[PDB]
Write a protein that binds this ligand. Structure first.
Ligand code: K3K
Ligand code: K3K
Ligand code: K3K
Ligand code: K3K
Lengths: 258, 258, 258, 258
């Protein structure tokens, strides 16, 4: 099948990439980074997130595999010493949900797809937004920002903000607060919120309309913003799996002991 | 249809109950508290939880309705002044997931059904249990206790322990920690965990085998315990709904402003 | 005595300022905004913080008074209707501790004084600093930022970040974390830290040396930073008090009920 | 001088105790467990807490030393291999603040002294108390319980409940909440509170007057309780120190890395 390999760029990941290509040259495999069937990421989670956004236009034709040259990553869960055994076996596919973000401007829409999370923060001044859940006004948020996480992203920024860890078989999204103000006049829910499919969470500005909006590792300053809509995407990321590595085991090895 | 009405027991709830029975006497309604089709709870959330466990053996034949005589309850979401309009209309059914708890003793099983949560605490001494997720050892918990919550229960004990709020259309359960110890030798995940259907969480004792186990308002001291198993139940609670009162709106009215 | 009055700038605060000046014109009072003995702030807490930094060079000769035209402020604790009674009485002085911040650059020092807090965040990239307590390396922090709060500032940014509320008679400073990363390789204390006088907390960069450093409402991007030192200042802010308004009462009225 | 040695009771701690007594027999030392000048605790922190309460009536005549046979303890900060060097040197004294607890019954007072903390929980039913700070009603607490911690106790139960870590040179006490209820009708401060000397925190029952009250490792069910008063004690615990082992270093070795 057609395949490609991306590398972290350091000495360890580049030469591991060249050896897998050589191993692939001994089979019916064509290296094609335009229309690959298999995308192998050699490096860390940030290297994997880059590989995902590289091919976000062909998600339903691609199965991703991650090899962790540094420590263990949640998306890169193959060790380098198991690379040759990986070449040979190259199985079943597993799918994780994704988050769809829509940004509307006063006076052309822009949509984005997130594998970890999308966050909103102020352009420098204070951050005030109204939070609207399915056209019903839920709260007015004053604080540092908000974070909307996929299931597989709940172990990332979401986890540092007090959010729950969520098994990736649950099609959902989770909203966490970043340092909300709560006193006699300002009031937020103060708990993470977990939304199912077809629920739309909208963020609407109260005064300032410039926001720093992130999607995974990308962060862009958006101006003249009127609304930011979140919902569980209809698209999914597909992984190539060759052995049982359960999510809760991977959580254990990354946070408890390994 | 056959119906019954339970009351908080105070003056307000008893006479509201008698007036609804009189209103029901003007229709083809039979008061039957042995095999009711409709169970109306007049009082608070604790009154509703009592009504649920009253008829936990006939959940698939019963639609529950709650009337809040005190403040607004998450399960009792009808005002007393709307009682006569409720008698007449007596619709669609909505279903919430439930939590199944299995307690095994050394040397007869015992199962329970929870609408809010089930919690485990020590019998007086220190609380130490091993947490096993789908036969894989996840962590050894040292602390005050653990809490396993349904979706509709996430706004109850779960919320006070830092857990996420979870829409009840998600068939899941959430585990929160009660004051875990974390230092150089003791280590827990420290985040709430959200499990899907068919995932089994088992709690196994390390030394002491006596535990205070709660299921909603009930709390019993269990002795010679070998295991406590949690999983999303196959049974569901069915509500009779007559108008749109979304979960996120009900969360807003109970915690933000009303 | 010599005095001055600063205003929020809106219609309510400006005309309340003019009426107090007229009332002061009926006594032995000289309006002097160069060397005042009394500084009256009419507006909110942000208006008060501006008044404090206006005269941070003459703190030991000035007693501050705050009048809250909007809601109740923690520093502006006089109601507008009590302005004429305030003119007449114009007592004892009470003193609150302050935080001293020292910023050193590679290749001229810069010092600052904070009434609420001082915070450090990254210039855009990831935030990594080593935390040194009295020349002993305590931890390497990876996250969004850190916050060092005075006692009276513990109800402000500090409170939103999970910090403790600290009575202002305690000469101390409190360090809170902003979304620290904690996994198998990255580790922080995760608890607020409360330091006494003469303890010096130093923050040292690991890679990037550009930081967004805030002191109360001011926030400046600092470049070529080598160290950021925190310690309880030797200077104190002095308030003019005319009646008993205890700190814990003021906390109650601002967060519990009023 | 007069001295005594208490042991954890296991094989390691008993024979280390006998060897130190033999080493002490080669000097002008008298083993006296009635009126000791020096109290050596060989074991863990719980062994040390037992030693403290053993001699709480003669705190101003006793200097405590702790040897950790198991892991490193916050109070037992001497390694077993350094026992003979400890015998010879047997210096300066350092003092840590303590917490005084007063329990009043309807229809004889009872006072207690705590080195870690004192906690209040319900006798089985729901826990509701009014919190009074210096005769001013602060809040009505509904939840699982409350915890009042000394500075050296802030790394113990206090830390697990979200409290701040507090250097023991600060004469203060810290109150943390155990799973408070917060909704439209019930409201607590939700933040840890740090009190200075001479501040009195009183807990008063609302309905049930039976409480489970703990002081360090002791926990007794108290009945017909009218009030529970907390304040920084006038008594202090004195340690014998032979080398520099700073508090923040000890925190680092116990929670970060060792
Ligand atoms: N304050 C802050 N606290 C916590 N996380 C924060 C954060 N600010 C940003 N992030 C995160 O950084 C992501 C972009 O960087 C690549 C990645 C990843 C990344 N993804 C995951 C993941 N799904 N699960 C676990 N760990 C992850 N990681 C690890 O994340 C750690 C640090 O990035 C490294 O251990 C990675 O292995 C961004 O999408 C956001 O999730
Ligand atoms: N420390 C502690 N913090 C927080 N909650 C704690 C708790 N200890 C026990 N509970 C809870 O008490 C339940 C049994 O009592 C009946 C109920 C309910 C009850 N159920 C819900 C619910 N599903 N959602 C919201 N509020 C609820 N309530 C409100 O719960 C409030 C107090 O009970 C009242 O406002 C009720 O209206 C038990 O199942 C456990 O969820
Ligand atoms: N995410 C975030 N969460 C929480 N607080 C954050 C924050 N980001 C910044 N701040 C804060 O903003 C301060 C500068 O603005 C003036 C002030 C004050 C201000 N000071 C205090 C104070 N000492 N105590 C209580 N409330 C205060 N206030 C209230 O603070 C509320 C909002 O500013 C208004 O109710 C003010 O009445 C800055 O020093 C930092 O403490
Ligand atoms: N849910 C819960 N979470 C957290 N701590 C809880 C708790 N319930 C009770 N405790 C605590 O247990 C104390 C009585 O036991 C002896 C001690 C000590 C003890 N004291 C300290 C201390 N000052 N600092 C650090 N660690 C300590 N320790 C360690 O505490 C750990 C477990 O006890 C062991 O590592 C000890 O080394 C009681 O006073 C209360 O502080």
């Amino acid at each position: 099948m057609k395949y490609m390999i991306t590398s972290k760029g350091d000495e360890k990941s580049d030469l591991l990439r060249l050896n897998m290509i050589a191993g692939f040259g001994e089979y019916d495999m064509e290296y094609d980074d335009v229309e690959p069937e298999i995308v192998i990421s050699i490096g860390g989670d940030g290297t994997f997130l880059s590989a995902f956004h590289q091919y976000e236009e062909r998600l339903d034709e691609i199965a991703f595999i991650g090899i962790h040259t540094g420590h263990l990553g949640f998306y890169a869960d193959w060790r380098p010493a198991e690379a040759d055994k990986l070449v040979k076996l190259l199985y079943q596919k597993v799918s994780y949900p994704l988050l769809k973000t829509t940004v509307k401007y006063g006076i052309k829409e822009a949509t984005y797809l997130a594998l970890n999370e999308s966050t909103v923060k102020s352009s420098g001044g204070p951050f005030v937004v109204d939070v609207v859940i399915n056209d019903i006004h839920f709260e007015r948020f004053r604080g540092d920002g908000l974070c909307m996480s996929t299931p597989s992203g709940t172990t990332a920024y979401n986890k540092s903000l007090g959010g729950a860890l969520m098994h990736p078989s649950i099609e959902a999204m989770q909203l966490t607060e970043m340092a909300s103000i709560n006193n006699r006049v300002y009031r937020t829910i103060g708990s993470p919120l977990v939304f199912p499919k077809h629920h739309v969470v909208s963020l609407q500005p109260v005064n300032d309309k410039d926001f720093q909006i992130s999607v995974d590792h990308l962060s862009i300053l958006h101006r003249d913003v009127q609304e930011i809509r979140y919902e569980v995407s209809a698209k999914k990321i597909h992984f190539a799996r060759f052995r049982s590595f359960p999510f809760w085991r991977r959580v254990h090895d990354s946070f408890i002991e390994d």
